[PDB]
Amino acid sequence: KLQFALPHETLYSEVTQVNLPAKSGRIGVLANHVPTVEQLLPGVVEVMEGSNSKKFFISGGFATVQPDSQLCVTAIEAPLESFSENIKNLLAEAKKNVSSSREAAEAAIQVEVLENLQSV
Amino acid sequence: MLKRFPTPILKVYWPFFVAGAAVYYGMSKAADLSSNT
Amino acid sequence: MPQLVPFYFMNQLTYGFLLMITLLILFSQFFLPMILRLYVSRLFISKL
Amino acid sequence: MQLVLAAKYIGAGISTIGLLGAGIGIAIVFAALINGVSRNPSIKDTVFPMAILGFALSEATGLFCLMVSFLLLFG
Amino acid sequence: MQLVLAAKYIGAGISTIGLLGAGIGIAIVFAALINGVSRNPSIKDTVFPMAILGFALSEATGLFCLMVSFLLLFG
Amino acid sequence: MQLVLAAKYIGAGISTIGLLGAGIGIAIVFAALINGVSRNPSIKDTVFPMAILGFALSEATGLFCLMVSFLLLFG
Amino acid sequence: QLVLAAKYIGAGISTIGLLGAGIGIAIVFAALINGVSRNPSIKDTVFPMAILGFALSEATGLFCLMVSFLLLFG
Amino acid sequence: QLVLAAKYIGAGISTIGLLGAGIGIAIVFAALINGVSRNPSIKDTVFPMAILGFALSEATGLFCLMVSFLLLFG
Amino acid sequence: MQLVLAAKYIGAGISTIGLLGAGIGIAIVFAALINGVSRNPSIKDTVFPMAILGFALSEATGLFCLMVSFLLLFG
Amino acid sequence: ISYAAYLNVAAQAIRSTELQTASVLNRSQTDAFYTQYKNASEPTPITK
Amino acid sequence: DESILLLTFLGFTGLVAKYLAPAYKDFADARMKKVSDVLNASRNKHVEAVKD
Amino acid sequence: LTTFSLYTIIVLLVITSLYTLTNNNNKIIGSRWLISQEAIYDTIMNMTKGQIGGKNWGLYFPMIFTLFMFIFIANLISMIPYSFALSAHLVFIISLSIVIWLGNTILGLYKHGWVFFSLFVPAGTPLPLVPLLVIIETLSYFARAISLGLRLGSNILAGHLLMVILAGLTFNFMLINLFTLVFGFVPLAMILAIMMLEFAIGIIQGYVWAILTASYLKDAVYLH
Amino acid sequence: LQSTLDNIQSARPFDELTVDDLTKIKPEIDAKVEEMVKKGKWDVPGYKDRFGNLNVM
C-alpha cells in the first residue's frame, strides 16, 4: 500500500502510480519500485490510485519505498486547491519580505514557495 | 484582406542592405574570375 | 558537381537578392500586420 | 586509370570509418531516453519527441560521411 | 587489374573498422535497459519496445557501414 | 597525372574521419537535454533554446571538416 | 605478388573491428553486475537481458571476424 | 605531381583533428544543460562560463582547420 | 626532393591528430566547472581560478603538438 | 538551517481555490517561548 | 533514373496523407474550436452587463 | 533568364498565397489553413522575444520572419523530385549567410562604436591571458560567418544526392532480372525512409537558422 | 437599454464575423495596429491572455 500522511491529518495511509518531487529530481513509483530513501522537496505531487489521479501540493517531507511495497510518504501541511490566489497576493508581500529578510533562509523559502505556486 | 501598414524599420535595415550591395558587386567580379579557367 | 559550378553566379545572385528584398517588404508591411489585425481584433473582443 | 579507380575504392573504405561516430551517437540518445523514462515513469510524452529530434540530427552527421563515401565509391 | 583487385580486398578491410562502433553502440542500449529496469522493475513492459527500437536504429548505422564492405567484397 | 587525381580522392576519404567526432557530439548534447528534463521537467522551456544552440555549435566543427573535403574535391 | 599480399593485409585490417565487441560484452556484464548489486533482486528477469546483450555485442564482432577470414582465405 | 598529391593527402589527415572539438563542444553544452536542470537558477552565472568553454573547445578545432589551409593553400 | 617535401606535408597532417585529445580535454575541465558550480551556487570563487589552471594545463599538451607540426612545416 | 526547520518555514508559507481551516491556522501559529538555561542560570524565554 | 525518385516521392506523400493530414485537420479544428468558444463567451459576457 | 529565376518567382507566389488564399476574408473565427500561419507567428514571437528580447525584438521580427518562411518553404520546394537548385545552389544560401553576418558586424560597429571590439573581450579572466581570449574569440566570431550557411547547405544538398545515388542503385537492381527486382524493393524502402528524414530535418534546420541568427543578433545588439 | 440589448441580439455575427467588420466598427483596430508597428512590438497580451496561443517551440 501507500502511506500518504500529515501529522494532524492522515490520507492514503503499493498504490498504482505516485509521482514525487525529490532531491533526486523527480521520482516515479509504479507498483513495486526498488526500495529507496529519498527526501521529498517542497512539491507538486501526483498520486494516482488506479487511473484516477489526485493532485497534491506538498510542503516536503520524506519518501521511503519499503521493500514490502510500502511507499511511506510523510509530509507536513499540504491541498493544492487550498493553497490557491490568496497565495498570489501573499507572493507580492513575500517579495517585499524577501527584500528585508535565518531571515535570509526565510526569504529563500519564500522564493521557493513562489516558484512552487507558479507550478500550480 | 490586404492592407499596407508602413514599417519605418527600413532605415533600421540600412547596414543589412549595404552588405547586400557590396556582395552584389563582388559576385560580379567573382563570376568573371571563375568563368575564366 | 556541374550543378554547383555554373558561370551564371552573378545572374543567379541578382534574382536571389531581389527575392529577398521583395519578401522582406512584403511580409513586413503587408502580411505581418494582417495577423496583427487578428491579434487586435481578438483584444477588442476580449474587451466586450 | 587503374590508380585513380583503386584510389576511389580505398578512399571509400576510409570514409566508411566516419559512420561509426553517428552509430554510437544513436545509442547515447536512446540511452538517455530509457534512463529518463525510468526516472519519472511519466516524462515520456514531452521527452519522446525530443529523442526523435536528437536521433535525426546525430544520424544526419553520419549520413554526410556516407554521401562522401558514395561520392568516391559509385562516383 | 591487379591494383583494382587488391583495392577490393584491402578496401573491404578498411570498411570493417566502422563496425566496431556499432558493437559498442548496441551494448550501450542494453546497459540503459538493465539500469532502467533496475530503477523500477515494472517499467519493463513499456520500456522493452523502446529498447528494441534503440537497438535497431543504432544497428542501422552499422548496417550502412557493413553494406559498403559487402559492395567492395562481392562487387 | 593519375597520381594527382588519386591523391585528391585519397585525401578526401581521409578528411571524412573527422566528422565522426561531431556525430557523437550531437548525441551528447541531446542526452543532456533528455536527462535534464527527466530530472526537473520545470526547466524544459528555459532550456529548449540553449539546447538547440548547443547542438548547432557542436555540429559546425564536423561541417568545417566536410568543407575541407569539398575544398579538395572541387579544388 | 600484390593480390596475395592484399588478401593477408585485408584480413589484418578486419581484425581491428573485434576490439569494439570486446568492450561491448564487458559493458553489458558491468550493467548486470551493477543492477544486481544495487537491488539484490532484479536478477531473475535481468539475467536473460544480460545474456542477450552479450550476444548482440559479440555478433557485431563476429561480422568483423568473418570478414577477416573471408579476406585471408578468399 | 607527387608534391600536389602530398598536399591533398596531408590536408585530409590534418582535418581528422576536428573530431576532438565535436565531442568537446558537446561535453561543455551537456554540462550546461545538466547543471541548469539540477539547479534551476544557476543559469545566469553558468551561461557565460559555458560559452567561454565552448569557444575554447572550438578553438582547438579551428587550429586543426588552419593547419589544413596552411598545407593546401600554403 | 618531391618525396622529401611530400613527407613534410603528409607528416604534418599526421602530426595534427594529437590536437583532438586537447579539444575533448578542455571540455572535460569545463564540464566539471559547470557541474560543481551548479551544485553549490557558491563554490565558484574558489573553483574558478582552479579551473583556469586546469584549462591551461590541458591546452599546453595541444600547444606541444602544434609545435611539432610547425617544426615539420615551417622548420 | 536545519532540514525540518527548512521544511517548517515552507509549511507555514503553505497555509496561504482557497479552503481554510482552524487546525491549519493553529499549526502555523504558536505562542510558545523557549527559555535558555545554563549552569540554574537562565538566559531569557525568547519567543519560539 | 529520376522516375524511381518520383516513385519514392509518391510514397512519401501517401504516408503524409495517411497519418499527418487527418491529424493536422483535427489540430486545426481544435484551435478553431477554442478560439470560437472564447469569442462567443465574450459576446455572452457583455450581454450580462447590459442586464446588470 | 535562368531556371534559378523561375523557381525564385515560384517561392514568391507560394508565400503570397498563404496570406491571400488561406483565410476566409479574415474571419476572426479563423480558418484551418490560417491557423498554421498563426502558430508560425506565435513561435517566432515567442522565439525572438526570447532570443533578441530586450527593449526591442519586434524591430527585427520581420527580418527573422522572412528568414523563417523562405527556408521553411524552400526545403519543401527543393524537395520536389523535379525542382532545381535554389538552396541547393549553395552560393545563394552561403551568400545570404555572409550578408547577414556582415550586416551584423557593421550594425555592431556602427551602433556600439570601437567598443564593438569589447565584444571580442569575452570575460574578466586573469590579465596575462586576456589578449589570447581576444584572438581566439575573433577567430570563432568569423567562424560564425561561414557556419550558419554551411549548416543548411550541407543538409539539403546531401539529402538530395544521397537519394539520387541510392535511386540509381535500385534502378540497376530492377534493370537486371526479376529475382533482383525481388529484394530491389528492400533498399527502395530505405530511400522512402531517408526522404521522410530529409523532410523532417529541413524544417529542423529552418528553426536552427533563425535561432542562430537570433543568437548572433543577441550578441551583436547586447555587447558581450 | 432595451434598445441596446436588442441591438446586441439583432446585430451580432459570430459566424461570418470578420476583422473587416471590426475595422468598420472601430477605426481603433487600424490605429492600434499601426501604433504597434511604430512601437516595434507585435505581442498583444490578450491574444494569449484569454485567446488561445500556442508556440510550436
Residue numbers in the entry:
A (entry chain H): 11 to 23, 26 to 90, 92 to 97, 99 to 115, 118 to 136
B (entry chain Y): 1 to 37
C (entry chain Z): 1 to 48
D (entry chain 1), E (entry chain 0), F (entry chain 2), I (entry chain 4): 1 to 75
G (entry chain 9), H (entry chain 3): 2 to 75
J (entry chain I): 8 to 23, 27 to 49, 53 to 61
K (entry chain U): 54 to 105
L (entry chain T): 26 to 249
Sentences from the paper on this structure:
We purified S. cerevisiae ATP synthase with the detergent n-Dodecyl-β-D-Maltopyranoside (DDM), which results in a monomeric preparation of the enzyme, and determined its structure by cryoEM. Three-dimensional (3D) classification allowed particle images to be separated into six rotor positions, corresponding to the catalytic and binding dwells for each of the three main rotational states. Further classification of the State 1catalytic conformation resulted in classes distinguished by variability in the position of the peripheral stalk and a slight rotation of the rotor relative to subunit a. These classes were designated as State 1catalytic(a) (light blue) to State 1catalytic(d) (dark blue) in order of increasing straightening of the peripheral stalk (‘no ATP’ condition). As these structures were determined in the absence of free ATP, they likely represent energetically similar conformations that can be reached by thermal fluctuation of the enzyme structure.
